[PDB]
Structure formats: structure tokens, C-alpha cells
Amino acid sequence: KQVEIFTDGSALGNPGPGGYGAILRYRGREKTFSAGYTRTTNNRMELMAAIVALEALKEHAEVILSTDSQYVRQGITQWIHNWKARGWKPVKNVDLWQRLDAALGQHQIKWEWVGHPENERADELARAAAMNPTLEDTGYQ
Ligand SMILES: [Mn+2]
Ligand SMILES: [Mn+2]
């Protein structure tokens, strides 16, 4: 019952137009997730990509999440546990981190920090979305 998730973000500014791209692969078949925002950051899009994808799952499963985000990696391996222990204090992009934390709750997540062409596919989706934003990142306050 393993499921592969590949994510990436893109941003043409900080803040600026941005987008996320996620590839959800299971049993040779895969689903795609991407959307662009008018004003956001790559960091937020990186998180958003994981969130949308994990929340697409309607049942517990072994998930292998692959991403080249240095932000997500640091957050997950060095900050997350401390933020939760301190009562999420709030912390920058707390809205997304808490959202992701929840999603990663009902799942057996195995992280793969970046060889898969799928990561490039996510990159392409995120960049395309950043160039054609249709949403607003209400969380970027
Ligand atoms: Mn990236
Ligand atoms: Mn990229």
C-alpha cells in the first residue's frame, strides 16, 4: 500500500507570482496537482504542494514524499518538533506548517530529500502555474 509523492514550488518573486506542482503516483498510475497564486513565496508553494497532495489521500497509506526543498527539509528535520513543543510560537507560515503537520499525521511518511524524473515533472508543473496564477495566497499575511 505504498504511494509516491513528488513536490515542488516556483516563485517569480519574494513575494511574487508563484505555483506548486505535485505528482501522486500509485500502482503505475499517477495524478497531478498544480495551481498558481498572484502573491506568494517559493517556500509556501513548496509546503502547499505537499499539503494538497497528502490531503488528496482518503485513507492511511505508506507515503514516500520526495522534494528538493531545503526549506521543507530543514523544517521537518530541525524545526517542526520544536515548533509543536512550543505551541507553534506565531511561527512564519504557521498556517501551512500546521496544515502539513496534520496531513502527515494519519500517514506513515518516508522522506526522500533530493533519482526520479517525477521531481522534474513537479518542477515543470509548478513553474507553469507560477506563470499563470489564478488564485490568491490568503495565507501570506
Ligand atoms: Mn524546489
Ligand atoms: Mn524546481
UniProtKB/Swiss-Prot annotation:
Q: Name one GO molecular function term.
A: nucleic acid binding
The UniProt entry, under PROSITE patterns, shows: RNASE_H_1
User: Which residue numbers delimit the RNase H type-1 domain?
Assistant: 1-131
Q: Which cofactor does it need?
A: Mg(2+)
The protein depicted here goes by the name: Ribonuclease HI
Subcellular localization(s) per the UniProt record: Cytoplasm
Keywords per UniProt: Cytoplasm, Endonuclease, Hydrolase, Magnesium, Metal-binding, Nuclease
> For binding Mg(2+) 1, which residues are annotated in this chain's numbering?
8, 46, 68
Q: Known EC number(s)?
A: 3.1.26.4
Function statement: Endonuclease that specifically degrades the RNA of RNA-DNA hybrids. RNase H participates in DNA replication; it helps to specify the origin of genomic replication by suppressing initiation at origins other than the oriC locus; along with the 5'-3' exonuclease of pol1, it removes RNA primers from the Okazaki fragments of lagging strand synthesis; and it defines the origin of replication for ColE1-type plasmids by specific cleavage of an RNA preprimer. Involved in production of retron derived msDNA (a branched RNA linked by a 2',5'-phosphodiester bond to a single-stranded DNA).
Instruction: Enumerate the InterPro entries for this protein.
Output: RNase_H (IPR050092), RNaseH-like_sf (IPR012337), RNaseH_domain (IPR002156), RNaseH_sf (IPR036397), RNaseHI (IPR022892)
Stated family: Belongs to the RNase H family.
Known partners and oligomeric status: Monomer.
The residues listed in the UniProt record as binding Mg(2+) 2, with positions renumbered to this chain, are 8, 123
Question: Please, which domain of life does this record's source organism belong to?
Answer: Bacteria
- Which catalytic reaction applies to this protein? Endonucleolytic cleavage to 5'-phosphomonoester
Q: Which organism is it from?
A: Escherichia coli (strain K12)
A GO CC annotation recorded here is:
cytoplasm
For this entry, list what GO says about its biological process.
DNA replication, removal of RNA primer
Task: Describe what happens without this gene.
Answer: In a strain that encodes a retron, the msDNA is abnormally sized.
The record's free-text note on cofactor binding: Binds 1 Mg(2+) ion per subunit in the absence of substrate. Requires millimolar levels of Mg(2+) for maximal activity. Has low activity at micromolar concentrations of Mn(2+) and is inhibited at higher Mn(2+) levels. Can bind a second metal ion at a regulatory site, or after substrate binding.
